[PDB]
Amino acid sequence: QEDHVRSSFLLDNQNSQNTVTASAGIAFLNIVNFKVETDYISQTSLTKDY
Amino acid sequence: YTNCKTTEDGQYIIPDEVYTIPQKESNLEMNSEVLESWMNYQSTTSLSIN
């Protein structure tokens, strides 16, 4: 009796996250006041199994 | 089948004009091939403007 078992498993994972925050605030002597902010978050995940 | 000749192990009747050699040989061959593939892609984009 003979038995031969060959098993090959492969996994790849790539996760890329980018976060950009830009804020600007100007405050004069209680006459002009402007505050703005922008947030951009992008997360991408890719998995490959064999 | 005048003499009702029987095989030595007693499992079949052979006629007088024949003789059996018990070459009881079994050959089994089982082959199994399994290919599996898994792919998952996840993207999440979040944008905030205040």
Residue numbers in the entry:
A (entry chain F): 217 to 266
B (entry chain G): 67 to 116
From the paper:
Perforin‐2 (PFN2, MPEG1) is a key pore‐forming protein in mammalian innate immunity restricting intracellular bacteria proliferation. PFN2 belongs to the membrane attack complex‐perforin (MACPF) family and shares structural homology with bacterial cholesterol‐dependent cytolysins (CDCs; Gilbert et al, 2013).
The isolated converted pores exist in two major conformations, a flat ring conformation (68.5%) and a twisted conformation (15.5%; Figs 3 and EV2), both structures comprising 16 mPFN2 subunits. The twisted pore is slightly larger than the flat ring pore, due partly to a break in the β‐strand packing between subunits at the cracking interface, the inner diameter being ~ 90 Å (measured between two subunits at the top of MACPF domain). The conformations of mPFN2 subunits in the twisted pore are almost identical to those found in the flat pore (pairwise root mean square deviation (RMSD) = 0.085 to 1.204 Å), although the transmembrane β‐hairpins in the MACPF domain bend more towards the pore interior. The intersubunit hydrogen‐bonding register of the twisted pore remains unchanged (purple lines), indicating that the accumulated rise is caused by a mild twist of the β‐barrel rather than a shift in hydrogen bond register between adjacent subunits. The plasticity of the transmembrane β‐hairpins therefore determines the structural variation in pores, suggesting a relatively straightforward conversion can be made from twisted to flat forms of the pores; the twisted form may therefore constitute a transition state for pore formation by complete rings of subunits, or alternatively could be an independently‐functioning pore‐forming state of the PFN2 oligomer. The twisted form also shows a mismatch in the detergent belt, which corresponds to the position of the lipid bilayer with respect to a membrane‐inserted form of this oligomer.
